[PDB]
Structure formats: structure tokens, C-alpha cells
Amino acid sequence: QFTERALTILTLAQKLASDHQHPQLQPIHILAAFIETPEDGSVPYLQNLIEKGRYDYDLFKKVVNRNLVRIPQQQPAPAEITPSYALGKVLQDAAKIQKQQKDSFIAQDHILFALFNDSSIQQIFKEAQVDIEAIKQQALELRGYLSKYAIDMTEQARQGKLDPVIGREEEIRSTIRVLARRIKSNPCLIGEPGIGKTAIIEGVAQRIIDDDVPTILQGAKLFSLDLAALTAGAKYKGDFEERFKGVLKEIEESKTLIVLFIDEIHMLMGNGKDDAANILKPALSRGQLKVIGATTNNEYRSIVEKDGAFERRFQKIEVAEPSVRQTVAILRGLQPKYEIHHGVRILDSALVTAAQLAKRYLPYRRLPDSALDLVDISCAGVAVARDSQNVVDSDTISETAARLTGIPVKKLSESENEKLIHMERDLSSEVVGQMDAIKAVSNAVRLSRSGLANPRQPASFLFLGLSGSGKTELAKKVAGFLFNDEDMMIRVDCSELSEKYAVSKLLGTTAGYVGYDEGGFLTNQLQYKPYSVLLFDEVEKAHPDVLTVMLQMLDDGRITSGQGKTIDCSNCIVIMTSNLGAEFINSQQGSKIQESTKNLVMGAVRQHFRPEFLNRISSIVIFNKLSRKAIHKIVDIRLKEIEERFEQNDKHYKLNLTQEAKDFLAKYGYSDDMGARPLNRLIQNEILNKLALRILKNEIKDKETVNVVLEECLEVLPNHE
Amino acid sequence: QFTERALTILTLAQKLASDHQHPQLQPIHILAAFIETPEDGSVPYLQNLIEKGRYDYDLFKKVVNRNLVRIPQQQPAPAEITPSYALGKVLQDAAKIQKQQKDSFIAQDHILFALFNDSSIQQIFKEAQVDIEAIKQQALELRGYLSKYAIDMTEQARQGKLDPVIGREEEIRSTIRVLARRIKSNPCLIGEPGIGKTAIIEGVAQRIIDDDVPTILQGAKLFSLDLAALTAGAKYKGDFEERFKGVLKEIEESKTLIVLFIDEIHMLMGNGKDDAANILKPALSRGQLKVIGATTNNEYRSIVEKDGAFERRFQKIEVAEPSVRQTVAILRGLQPKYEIHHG
Amino acid sequence: ISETAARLTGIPVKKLSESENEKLIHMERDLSSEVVGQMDAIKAVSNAVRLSRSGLANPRQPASFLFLGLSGSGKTELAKKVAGFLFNDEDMMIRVDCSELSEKYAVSKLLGTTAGYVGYDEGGFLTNQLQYKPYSVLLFDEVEKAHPDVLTVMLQMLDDGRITSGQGKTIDCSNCIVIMTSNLGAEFINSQQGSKIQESTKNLVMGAVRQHFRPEFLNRISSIVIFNKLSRKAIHKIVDIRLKEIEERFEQNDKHYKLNLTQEAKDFLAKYGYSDDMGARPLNRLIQNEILNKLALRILKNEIKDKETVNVVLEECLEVLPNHE
Ligand SMILES: Nc1ncnc2c1ncn2[C@@H]1O[C@H](COP(=O)(O)OP(=O)(O)OP(O)(O)=S)[C@@H](O)[C@H]1O
Ligand SMILES: Nc1ncnc2c1ncn2[C@@H]1O[C@H](COP(=O)(O)OP(=O)(O)OP(O)(O)=S)[C@@H](O)[C@H]1O
Ligand SMILES: Nc1ncnc2c1ncn2[C@@H]1O[C@H](COP(=O)(O)OP(=O)(O)OP(O)(O)=S)[C@@H](O)[C@H]1O
């Protein structure tokens, strides 16, 4: 109800009546409280609403002292009988004043006002008007000041607005050590955004709230300064100093250990300096004016480069991210806040896994926030879904994260079935033979899905064999099964090389040079798409400088960029290709991959491909030769897909191909030295060419047949009508 | 003294005395100043105390006009002699109110009140602005509007004027889930141009309109922000921050919640940062301030590489491209829009 | 002065902690539990940090070593492990991806954008990291493929430990540690003349080092460090370690091996994979390809719900807990 100051003045009125041996309390006794002390700082006595308003404080002093002498000496027992209606009314009026003034507590000024409004000198010896406006003016110009300049974190903390923080006790102590300096009063927190800089300032506030602060700072209070009053609050040229200088001086003395702080101190460098608030502050740094700032490391760098002065006042305080275990500790401290915020229970394992998840899948975010996001997001997820529950650790988190960050890998299937149990079948259905390539694909994904693959390495395989054997097709089909979308594959022509390639590859352009589109094909796409299948079109012909660079993705997945940042791959499957082995494939020694032969190939590949790459690669995969037996399946597969891809079914075929057509293809388009690719030449050269002509001649109205000639031919529906 | 809002009204009042070529400014010119133009945020006329007080502000304007035509002269050379003793009193009364309120400047709120104390309609059943007690009941809702700076997407959606979505419901659900968060409340739609990120934000408006959103977001008023308000409304250093702060404060309190939408985040990020206004939003972003944003993945790149601050305020959401069949579904959803569009 | 300065400037080298028993004295031991063999390499780094902490390191220069030998000999692994030991965090390693480098260099590494040129993100990757983080350890990956102009300018830090940027600012973090790597020596370790590389062979390595790098580098490096091939008993040891580390790292340990590697599983990995030119990585890949992928399937099929074992089947295979145990 009352401020401590208001209570003091009222209390003094009461106790002065006791000390002066006076019966019922009168307006006189509150006036006695007003003149209770010689201290000029006491507004009720010298730096008064009277003295700086309209009348000599002595006039009033003598009104009161005359009256105090005039009231007769009583037995101590009644010395302060009651406030009666007289002081009751003054206090009630002080409350009416609060309502008029919109003041949350009764001020000593409300007591000064209310008393003065009711009061009049009781005797002819002194006269003075109750100059209400003068006393209000003087009251308004005193004490109330920071609500116009900075947000009072400490009182708001007393009011429960503070978020307590843990695990930063040294960082908090560091700000204390700096704040405890006698000369260099200015600390600043420097680090990554999301590192916990504001959190540390609030940590200081927590230290203040629990009064765990050294005498120099023991009475401290924190206030959030800048942008509003320092920028929005400006229309005139001197507005960088009006209000700003004002508050700097308002807080230098008496009013406890006021410490302002800046959360976004980046501004305080000035756009071209020009003392845009920025210089006046350090200009006054020889004393008081204790302020703590906060900036990111790069913003720090920028304000340093753009100023050269605040840095002589401000102590650089480095803030490091916590370890995963430490992150969990803060998560635990924060856990109940989240359970409350969302009305859901959270498992300790939720917190544990959130933190390690973040380390694994959120490289662009710091652990404090990243882990918290996984928690607060999961909780929010449930809060929305709550119309139905609680948060369940990795269950909720893996799904939640995958939904936002990508990586469905962690969701686990409703049924593993086609999801890597029967996948070898499904892959063998799309492509024929080459089961080891198929197994490699499945295994790559299975290890990823199971959390077993070495996390530092993307699945990586190099595919050897004769072009036309399905090496690209495999990669595309992998994307097919990986995303249920074959166009999500990333494919780079790795053979387009000379040394002049930086940006075309993950290296990017370099900032400071023309062009700021970097590694678009790889770096930008990788940043955007957390995983894919990356196909390198004949690494056999790629320049070795690039291959050496690609190695970095191949293993130890970290990826740099000319932007000064990194990408850091993880879950992208990479596929490299070569036909070196064609020199051995053309031996035609069985459809199966032969021992020794395949080794001569891989040996030669190393000779013509840095083994350093191959010494990191998950494995080299070799394709089976497409024997006619393989063809006997492939032809149907391809004719089916080829037809299905032909726009819409306004015609298409009945396809009475039977063995006769199949064999023709196996006897005519079947080049032992070019895989199935020449069968496609046959198919288009014969089947589609005739078809196109029949369509062109409008000899087909709907459907179509394939009729073996002894070659192939088509039928006529309308007779060239 | 007076601030810009009060000065605008006062300026208009004096202008009106000259618009009517009258030697002096009268209370009627001020009442006319209160009702100048149909700009909703004008508390003196439309989003006013009058409507809240159950009065017809246009009828009142007819009253004002009936009084303005009774001005005894419109003689040119005689015009513009004095502000009048009558309004001396009113402006002095405004100063008294400032003292009553501990206010360092006279706002339109105060100048309204002061005239109202001295205003009248010579009518028993006055069609006047609601009497002073109501003036206080509603005037006290002020201090202690966004439509000036943004389009109410939710209201447009309530009025239809919206194109339905398909498939993107999942990123919408993600958006709702992010908005529902206590700390990082801001989802952002990131991806290729043309994917449907605007379509998603309209989809969000639909969910609000359709009551498919939990109460804490259900009542949200979704707005299309900045650009014009940000820069077209600018002239000088700091007035970006002023409009920003104004809006941010509005969304900070009382009106359940307001959600702001930023389509092209690149519009922010200052200029090499330099805290060139943009930063205020991140600065205050901790106070819930539910915001939805968007950006081209490459734009995201060009700003995320530089910023780092907004990243702790928003949730990155990739928006997937629909398959051909899904695309057909959108075409089907929009089919009636197209048939209507061209007949 | 040391403690308060350290809290603000890091400088752990100025602490002189009572924990030296572990904090350097047992460093070689601790590192040998992480790194198999490569005794001299372990000692080389350890020696440098001992001079740092003892105040004997000369402020004019960072610790500097060149790691030569078979890829998969643990060259970058050692470097990471000393980041681990030295700063209690392997991820603090500022690996310098030197082969990822063109003549543009500047920003992506140590110099940054010449001030006044567009892009005010300057030396973000290396210099700014030191600017922000007084010192750490840096690892120069495959310096053989670094652009020559860059190899040359980085010499300003190699000795006369200066770091002048395009920002117009200087860091001079001579307190750091740098490790350079190369596969240059692989051609001589491939002589396979015992597991430990002998004299003459090392001279050939150094011959090649001189062909690749100038005295302007080579005589500034604290030492060239040449890595050995692992002994068959040593790979036995690395196998044990890696298998344990992999499972220990395995996200949530929802599944769990008895890890009955016995002599036999370990021998199968060693015998099946120990080519003298392989590097330890293929043994690690082998177990992933031999068993772990089978495990993944067993998990997916619910053959492994919890726990797991090791079993040896001659050829190799993996047992199940077929009742979804
Ligand atoms: N040590 C900690 N104690 C308590 N809360 C923490 C801690 N670390 C992080 N947080 C959480 O992190 C969020 C605010 O993070 P901060 O690190 O202050 O953000 P910030 O990094 O200060 O913002 P910048 O980077 O200066 S814009 C809050 O929601 C806190 O719950
Ligand atoms: N589900 C949907 N997916 C895609 N587009 C849709 C969808 N529903 C409606 N549309 C319409 O298709 C267009 C999608 O455009 P936007 O979402 O603006 O594209 P964008 O992702 O915002 O990229 P910009 O910035 O508009 S080029 C809009 O003009 C919508 O009217
Ligand atoms: N002696 C060893 N002690 C511990 N780990 C080892 C050892 N040798 C190899 N490794 C493993 O090898 C992998 C890293 O191998 P390194 O030989 O450092 O790679 P690298 O050959 O240094 O890379 P380059 O060739 O310089 S790009 C790690 O996954 C280690 O587990």
C-alpha cells in the first residue's frame, strides 16, 4: 500500500507525538514529521515543496514548532492516542491521490499533498496558501526516474519477472568482479547469440535478489537501457543527449547502486560515431555510471572496429556454451517452468536427449537455446495436441525435431516393413541385380536410422562399373526411397573441373570479392536440406583438387565456406562414380563380379584416384554385368516406367510384348559393352519411332499393341481417317 | 506543451478557422478538427470514445457542420486574428489536465477532454460525444493503432478475400506449434519462391477464422506489416523506431494477442545492421510478441549469415514443394476461384 | 593476477595448478589411452605444452608440429585428442581445412576482408576465433593442397607468431598450438619396413617434405613428427578402444552389447582387415559393415529390443534376442 518513505513519514508523525508527549494525533504531528530532520535531502524539510515552490520553509517550520510547543504535555501513556478521523482522512486522501496519480504505492509526496490539502495554519502568527500546484510541481520533478529510460529488472525480479539461471555462477561472478572495480565500472558480455548473455545479466539480477552481492554492489539494481528512450524517443538533434545525459546524471548518486544495462549494445558505437549517445557515455567514465553491456562476438568486433573508445571502459567478458551435460543441468532447472507453461509433464530423459539431439542436429544454434527449443517446442507441440497429454522424451522430441529440422530418420516407423526390412526387395524391384549396391544403400540408411553409423561420417560409396548398368539410376532410386521422391537427389557434375572452381563447389566465393552466392549447388543446398543423396558424375574425371575437398564431406563431415562459416554435413548419402572398371567389365568373364579382376580395378582406381579419399569412403561398390537374365527383368521394368511417364493415358499400350519382343530386345539392343542403355536406344528407335508415326498419322485412337515381325510393328485403329 | 498528435488537432482547428475565413478560432473549429477525415485510428472521430459511448459520430459531424455554417462571416482580409479567449480557457484547461495526470505533454486525448469540458450542443438530447464520465471510461483505455501500419489479414479472411490451401497444413500446424511456444514464439517460413509461404500465412489466417487453433492463438489478430509503414512512413532518424515501438507496445498488451506477419524479413536487418531500427523488434521479442515471418532460403542465407540475433527469436521452418498430384489438389481447391475470376 | 586475468583472458598456461599430476604430468598416459601407439607424436605435443605451462615456451612462437604418415595412423585424431585433453573439449579444435582453399583466401581463414571491401565478416573462421578465444589449437588439414600463396602468408603465424588481419587489426596469438598434417610421408611408411619407421625411411619422408615445402616453413616448425604403423598388437588395442567408444557414444544406449569381443571377434577384425597400408579406419568401417549394419537390421526387425551380444561365426555373423529381448 505504502512506500517505505511514506511509512517513514507517517511513522515519524506518530512517534514524534509520543516523544513530544502529545494526545490525539493532529495534522500538526504529520507536519512535525515533515520537519523531523535537518537533512536537506529530506523533501518534507528543506528541498521542499514549500521552499522550492512558493514559501519559506521557515514559515512552515515555525508553524509547526509553535504548534508543537502549544500542545500541552501529556502522560506518556496517551502520547499518540490515535490518528482519529484526522490522520485517517490524510492517509485515505493519500490513497485517493494514488488513484489520481496512477501510483501503485503511497508516496511521501502523497502524504505531503494530502496533509497540505487538508491543513491550514491554526493561528494568526503564520500564514501561507496551500499552493497545490507548486507543491505538485516540485514533487513531480523529484525521484521519478528510470521508468522513462530503462526497465527495472531488479524490481521486476522482486515481482517474479526474472528467469533464474544456473551453471553460469563464474560468469556472474565475473561481472561482479568487473562491477566491483573502482575505476573501470563497465563490463560487457561477449559471445554467441543464444549463449546466455541476457541470462547472465539476469543471473546478476538473481544474485542481487538473493542479496549475494559485495558491498560495492550490495545495494545494486539492474535497469535495461537503449533503443526506446535512446532512439525512438528522438525528434530533435540533441535528443541523443537529452534524456540520455539526464539519466546518466540522475543515477550518479544517492539512489542506491544503480546499474544500467544494455542488451543490444551494438548500437553504441554510433553510425559513424558522431556521438550518437555512444561517446557521451565513455566521456563520463571517470566515475559512477556503472553499466553492463552485452554483444555477440561479431557485434563486439564490429563495435570495436567502428569505435575504438568504449573498449577502454568496457571489460570483455567471454561467455562459452555449456557442455551437453551442463546444458541438461540448465534444462532441469528450467524443466518445471516448461511443465507449468504448457501444463504437460516432461521426462528427465527428455531433457537429456534434447541436449544431445541438439548437438547432433542443430549446428547453427548454441546448446542453451537449442536444447530449450527442443523442450519448449515439444511441450508446445503437446500443448496444441493437448486437446487429446504429456511430453514423452525422445518420442515427442524425435518427431518434433524431424518435423521442424528435417531428419525423419529419428522418428522410427509405425512398421519397419518397406522402411528397410523389405527395402532390399524394393530396391531390387526398381533395379536389377547389383545386390551389393542394394545392400549398401539399405545398410547406409539402416545405420543412420538406428543411430549407429559413426555420426561424423555420411554414408559414402563409390560405384564402379560400366555406364548403362544403372549407377545413376541407383542414386536416383535411393532418393526415391529416401524421400519417397526421386527428384530430391542432389547431383553435381564433378567432371567439370579445372582449378578455377571455388564457388561452384562447396568452397563458395570469398567475402571481400565480387559475388556472394556461395557453393549454391552444394553449400547452399546442403544448408537448406539437412540430408539427401549426393551424386558425383564420374569422379574418375574430377580434378583432384576438388576430390580432396570432397573428402572433407566424405568423412569428418565438417564443411567450410568463404562466408566465414561452415555447413557441416551429416546425413547426406554420397555417391561417387567411375568407369575405370569398364576395362575389366569388358572381359565379360561371367555376370558376377570376379575376385582379382575387381581388385585390379580398385587398385587402378586408387592409382587414378587419390586413395586418401578411398581410405575414408565407406566402401567401393561394384556392379553386376547386365546379363540377358538381368535383361529379362529390366526390359519389363523399363518399358513399364517409360510408358507410365508418357504424359497421360489417352492412348498408351496393351503391350502384348511377350517373350518375342523381349528376346528381340535381348538380341538386338543388347550390347555387351554398353549395359542396358542400348536397349533404350532400341526401344526408342523402334517402339517409339513407329508409335510416334502411328500417333502422328492419327492411326491410334486409344491403346496400342506391340507385334513381332518375322522386328516389331504396331496396328491401325482408324484407317488414316 | 503539446505533442504531435495534439498539435495536429490544434493545427487543424486553426486551419479550419482560416478554411472558414473567420477572424477567430472557436470551439466549433476544434470540434471540426476532431472530425477531419475518415482515418480509423483517429480517436477524435472513428475509433473513438463516441462509438464506444453509443453515439453516431457522423450524426455528430452533421451537428458540427450545422454549427459551422452558422459562422457569421467568411470575409478574407478579416480572417486569422486570434485563437480566442474561449480557447485560451480550453488550452489552459488542457494544461490543468496535464497536471492532474503528471503528463509532460498534451496528447490528443487531453485536448479532447479539455474541449469536451467546454463543449456543447445546444440540444437537450445531445447527439454530442458521450459525456465526460464516459469520455474518461474510454479515454483511460489509452496509454496509462496498428491498422495505420498494417493490414488485418484476419479480418480480410473473415471477409473472405482469401485463397485456401492444401498440403501446407502441416507447416501451418508447425506454425501453430511454434506460436504456442513460451520463448521462441516466432515461426518463419523459409524456402523457394512460389512454394506457398504467403499461402501458408493465409492458411494461418484460415485456422484463426475457422477456430482450429487453441484459444491462446485462436483469438489472434494477424497483420501484414512494415515496408510501407516501416519506410514509406519515414522521414528522419529514429521515426522507424517510433512507429515500431508504437506497434510493439500495442501488441504487448490488453488485446488478447496480435500476431504480426513479415513476409520479406530482408526488409529488416538494418543496413549492415548498425542497429538501424530493425533491432528493436529482437530487443523486445522476449515479451512473447507473437510474430510470423518468412524469407527466400537464399535471402535467409544472406541475412542469417550476418545476423544471429533473430535466429534466437524465430523457428526456422522449411516449406516443402508439393508434388504434382498435390499441386493438382491445390488447383482443384482454387478451381472455383478461377472459374469465378474469369466467368 | 593470474586467476583474475585467466577468467578474462583464459591463459590456462599461467595457472600452475595443483592438479598438474593429471594436468600434464600424466598427459602422455592419458593420451595413450585415447591414441594407440604413436608414442613420439604424443610426446611431441606433450612436450610443447609442458613448456607453455612452465613459462618456457618462447612468446615469439606457437607450438608447431607437422604430422606425417599413413592416413588412418591417428594424425588428426591425435590433434583432436590433445584439444580434448588440453582444453577438456575436442570440439574446440580449430581445424583449419587447408585443402579447402583458393588464392582468394582472406576471409575464409586468417585475414578477413580488406577493410572497405564488401563483407564485414572478416577472418571469421580462424582469426576471429582467436580474437574471441585468446588461444586454442589449430589443425591444418592436408597442407599439401593448400594454395601456395596461402601457405606462404600463414607463415606470419608459424613463427614470429603474428596475426595481422585485413581488418587492420592484429591478434598475434603466439599462445596457440598449431598442428599441420600431410600424407606426404605415406609413400615411405608404405615401405612397411617394420611397424616403427626407422632412419633413412624418415629421411625420404623429409626429402619429400622439402620437395613440397620450403625452409621458410620447415625450419620454423617445432618438429616434424612422423607417425608409425601400428603393431598387430596395437591394432588389437585400437579395436578394443574403438568398439567401446562407438557404443559409449551411441546416442542413447537403448541397445547394449555384452561386448564379448573375446580374443576371436577382435582377431576377426584384425585378421580380416589388417593390411599394412590400410589405416585403422577400415577396421572401424569393417566392424560397421560386418556387424553394426546387421545390428541395425536386427533392431529394425525387433530381434534386438534391448541388450545385445557378440558372437563369432566362421566369415562372420551376429546373434539375436529373437523374442524381442
Ligand atoms: N544459464 C542459464 N540460466 C537460465 N536460463 C538460461 C541459461 N542459459 C540459457 N537460458 C535460456 O536462454 C534464453 C535466453 O537466452 P540468452 O542466452 O540470454 O539469449 P541471449 O543469447 O542472451 O540473446 P542474445 O544472444 O544476447 S540476442 C532464456 O529463454 C533462458 O531460459
Ligand atoms: N497450398 C498452396 N501452395 C502454393 N500456392 C498456393 C497455395 N494455395 C494458394 N496458392 C496461391 O499460389 C501462390 C503462392 O504464392 P506465395 O505463397 O506468395 O509464394 P511465396 O512462397 O510467397 O513466394 P513469393 O514471395 O509470393 S514469389 C499465391 O498466389 C496463392 O494465392
Ligand atoms: N593410433 C590411433 N589411435 C587412435 N585412433 C586412431 C589411431 N589411428 C587411427 N585412428 C582412427 O582414425 C580416425 C582418424 O584418422 P586419422 O589418421 O587422424 O585421419 P587422418 O589420416 O589424420 O586424416 P588425414 O589423412 O590427415 S585428412 C579416427 O576415427 C581414429 O579412431
Swiss-Prot record, chain A:
CDD domains: AAA (cd00009), RecA-like_ClpB_Hsp104-like (cd19499). It comes from Saccharomyces cerevisiae (strain ATCC 204508 / S288c). ATP 1 binds at residues 191-198. GO terms for biological process: cellular heat acclimation; cellular response to heat; chaperone cofactor-dependent protein refolding; post-translational protein targeting to endoplasmic reticulum membrane; protein folding in endoplasmic reticulum; protein refolding; protein unfolding; stress granule disassembly. There is a cross-link at residue 471 (Glycyl lysine isopeptide (Lys-Gly) (interchain with G-Cter in ubiquitin)). Residues 392-582 are annotated as: NBD2. Its main location: cytoplasm. It is found in: Cytoplasm; Nucleus. Changing residue 579 to A: Almost completely abolishes ATP hydrolysis at NBD2, but does not affect nucleotide binding, thus keeping NBD2 in an ATP-bound state. Reduces stimulation of ATP hydrolysis upon substrate binding. Belongs to the ClpA/ClpB family. Required, in concert with Hsp40 (YDJ1) and Hsp70 (SSA1) and small Hsps (HSP26), for the dissociation, resolubilization and refolding of aggregates of damaged proteins after heat or other environmental stresses. Extracts proteins from aggregates by unfolding and threading them in an ATP-dependent process through the axial channel of the protein hexamer, after which they can be refolded by components of the Hsp70/Hsp40 chaperone system. Substrate binding is ATP-dependent, and release of bound polypeptide is triggered by ATP hydrolysis. The keyword Flavoprotein does not apply. This is Heat shock protein 104. Residues 83-144 are annotated as: Repeat 2. Homohexamer, forming a ring with a central pore. The hexamer is stabilized by high protein concentrations and by ADP or ATP. Oligomerization influences ATP hydrolysis activity at NBD2. Interacts with YDJ1. Interacts (via C-terminal DDLD tetrapeptide) with CNS1, CPR7 and STI1 (via TPR repeats); under respiratory growth conditions. Present with 32800 molecules/cell in log phase SD medium. Changing residue 313 to M: Reduces ATPase activity by 80%. Impairs oligomerization.
Swiss-Prot record, chain B:
Belongs to the ClpA/ClpB family. Homohexamer, forming a ring with a central pore. The hexamer is stabilized by high protein concentrations and by ADP or ATP. Oligomerization influences ATP hydrolysis activity at NBD2. Interacts with YDJ1. Interacts (via C-terminal DDLD tetrapeptide) with CNS1, CPR7 and STI1 (via TPR repeats); under respiratory growth conditions. Residues 146-343 are annotated as: NBD1. It comes from Saccharomyces cerevisiae (strain ATCC 204508 / S288c). Residues 83-144 are annotated as: Repeat 2. This is Heat shock protein 104. Changing residue 196 to S: Largely reduces ATP hydrolysis. Alters bud morphology and causes septin mislocalization. ATP 1 binds at residues 191-198.
UniProtKB/Swiss-Prot annotation, chain C:
It is found in: Cytoplasm; Nucleus. Changing residue 142 to Q: In HSP104(TRAP); completely abolishes ATP hydrolysis, but does not affect nucleotide binding, thus keeping HSP104 in an ATP-bound state. ATP 2 binds at residues 69-76. Induction: By heat stress dependent on the heat shock transcription factor HSF1 and the general stress transcription factors MSN2 and MSN4. Expressed at a higher level in respiring cells than in fermenting cells. Expressed in stationary phase cells and spores (at protein level). Changing residue 100 to K: Abolishes the ability to refold aggregated protein in vitro and to provide thermotolerance in vivo. Homohexamer, forming a ring with a central pore. The hexamer is stabilized by high protein concentrations and by ADP or ATP. Oligomerization influences ATP hydrolysis activity at NBD2. Interacts with YDJ1. Interacts (via C-terminal DDLD tetrapeptide) with CNS1, CPR7 and STI1 (via TPR repeats); under respiratory growth conditions. Has 2 AAA ATPase type nucleotide-binding domains (NBDs) per monomer, a low-affinity, high-turnover site (NBD1) and a high-affinity site (NBD2) with a 300-fold slower rate of hydrolysis. There is allosteric regulation between the 2 sites. ATP binding to NBD1 triggers binding of polypeptides and stimulates ATP hydrolysis at NBD2. Nucleotide binding to NBD2 is crucial for oligomerization. Present with 32800 molecules/cell in log phase SD medium. This is Heat shock protein 104. A motif (Nuclear localization signal) lies at residues 228-244. Changing residue 281 to M: Reduces ATP and ADP binding at NBD2 6-fold, but does not affect ATP hydrolysis at NBD2. Reduces catalytic rate at NBD1. Residues 1-186 are annotated as: NBD2.
